[PDB]
Amino acid sequence: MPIAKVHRIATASPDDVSGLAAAIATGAIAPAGILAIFGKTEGNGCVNDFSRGFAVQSLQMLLRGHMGAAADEVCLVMSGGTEGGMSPHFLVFERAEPALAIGRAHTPDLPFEALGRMGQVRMVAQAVRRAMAAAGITDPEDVHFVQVKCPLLTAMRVKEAEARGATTATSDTLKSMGLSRGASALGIALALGEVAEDALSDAVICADYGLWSARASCSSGIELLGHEIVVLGMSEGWSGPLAIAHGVMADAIDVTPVKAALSALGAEAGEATIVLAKAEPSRSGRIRGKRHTMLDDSDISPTRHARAFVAGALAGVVGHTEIYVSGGGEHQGPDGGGPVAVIAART
Template sequence: MIRRAAVHRVAMRHPGDVAAIEALFDAGVPDPRDVVAILGKTEGNGCVNDFTRAFAVQSLTQMLAVRLGTAPAEVAHRVAMVMSGGTEGGLSPHFLVFSVGRTDAAANPAGALAIATAFTRDFAPEEIGRMAQVEATAEAIRAAASGMAEIHYVQIKCPLLTTERIAEAASRGATVATHDTYASMGLSRGASALGVALALGEVARDALADAAIGSDTALYSGRAGTSAGVELMRNEIILFGMSPDWAGDLVIAHDVMADAIDLPAVQRALRAAGLDAGGGQLPDAEQARLVAVLAKAEPSSDGRIRGARHIMNEDSDINATRHARALVGGVIAAATGRTALFVSGGAEHQGPDGGGPVAVIARRADL
């Protein structure tokens, strides 16, 4: 028997609403024992104090513990959970449930979606946003990537610094990368993304150093999506790729948006996954085959989009990443005809400055 990946997208009424996932389990697809990862877009602010992410993880963990007949701590060891806060604009809160089962069907020689998960050790506060996080992430990815012919996207949930964590490090005489808790989110995302770049050969090891993290925008991965949260101290990693040794009708493809309005990059990713909008929005039949879109959003540091000034970095009322999520979410929604999109803000070292990777999971038309 060989492995086959499945992806289910369900809506949520609030961050703790797991009823739609329970309905899937009640229907027998998927078997909760086969679930390897859950991604969620929650309606919080996506910042340090966004506890919608922790609320969703807690709710999912408790539900899975009951379904699996195990302790909540065991769930954390077997299921990677990546909650991304912020559904600004028209983005719709939703969960993506990823499972891996076994089948008697033949492997797809053209390649099928393959999924692997990995977990780093817990980081000390002084390691967050520094090379220790980069190297531990790269090591975990290399170990998990065995047998995956092509890796198209690596989704990571990473930790951030809080005042309490900073104080704990200071009590031991350790210094942290920053005392700004919000800035720590970007450094953690950036270090995690550079770990992807290092593991996938996109950046050379000798180009990396603590000082480059969060500052050298020329260093980036075109296949990393990282999201920081207060609810963990390790990196939880999900690899999405293609393999001729897996069965199924799901495929994944990716591209890189050069800036926040790079619609052609989104359309290239859709076409690479076998979907054709004919230059416009996906028609109904193509939308039915679209399973998920994963993307990153980041305001350009120079305050410009194709020469025109934007104020995302200067708005004291609304955080810049919230603006970016709404903007990129709107561009992708227009291309796909869908608002349940996993658009995550904060793209440090994830694509070029002001841009970011976009990945598409779809069903083949010929299967």
């Protein structure tokens, strides 16, 4: 009889762990039961975003203090970029004593020449199986959202790779984020059976954006070399007030999937609603026939636009700004769209 408990904690700063410390001090959260922490941090959400790594170090110090080496098994998904009115926050996932289930998993360092290729797809497919097992889930149809934290390439990482005779899938550092999210997304797809294995090859990745998962949510970062996996789903072997529902946004302003999730969860939009969504600029250069400018803008990187825009669209529906919106939906939902999940209690 395990219990899922999800806690949304405000932050004033990437290094501001004061509020999580407080939930531990008041015994609202028990350090021993922390599975994973998601975050929105104030960085640019792209390559040179050190708010991500900054938060990670700060969370590491605090969690090790309370659980020493067992902190290292906690999944830290720090997703940068809080544009528009999107409010920075931590999402703490704690395990307690059918309802919401949580499973986690890790991977070894990822060879720079494996990134964006079938190497990454595999190595991630496995972790998703392990973590969805640890969640106590056997039916893929009972999975609702799979978060992945993946690596990326810098110019210096690229030249290091070439120095030992290897080639990387790109030398463009920002493209390398897309490849990593995409390859990871297909790995998630593979493990949930949304894609056939012989449908995949290096040439397919970030090319056939017709292959996609309705549940992949992948976030790239400069601060890790392997992967973090967190599976959220519904299970018979879990109990508690919290359930999760999900849907696919067809484009950047498609908010009906969220209204549908709330219905399924039997909850109404309010400050209490937890929202996880992927935002992506559509590669057509259009939304519902109308041209957009995100792919042609040299000042503000495309994912910064997408986040700002869908965060606004979603906040207009759910009524508050503490929502988790993540940019770049390579093979995560249809092109121009992305998965969205809601976590609420029944009324």
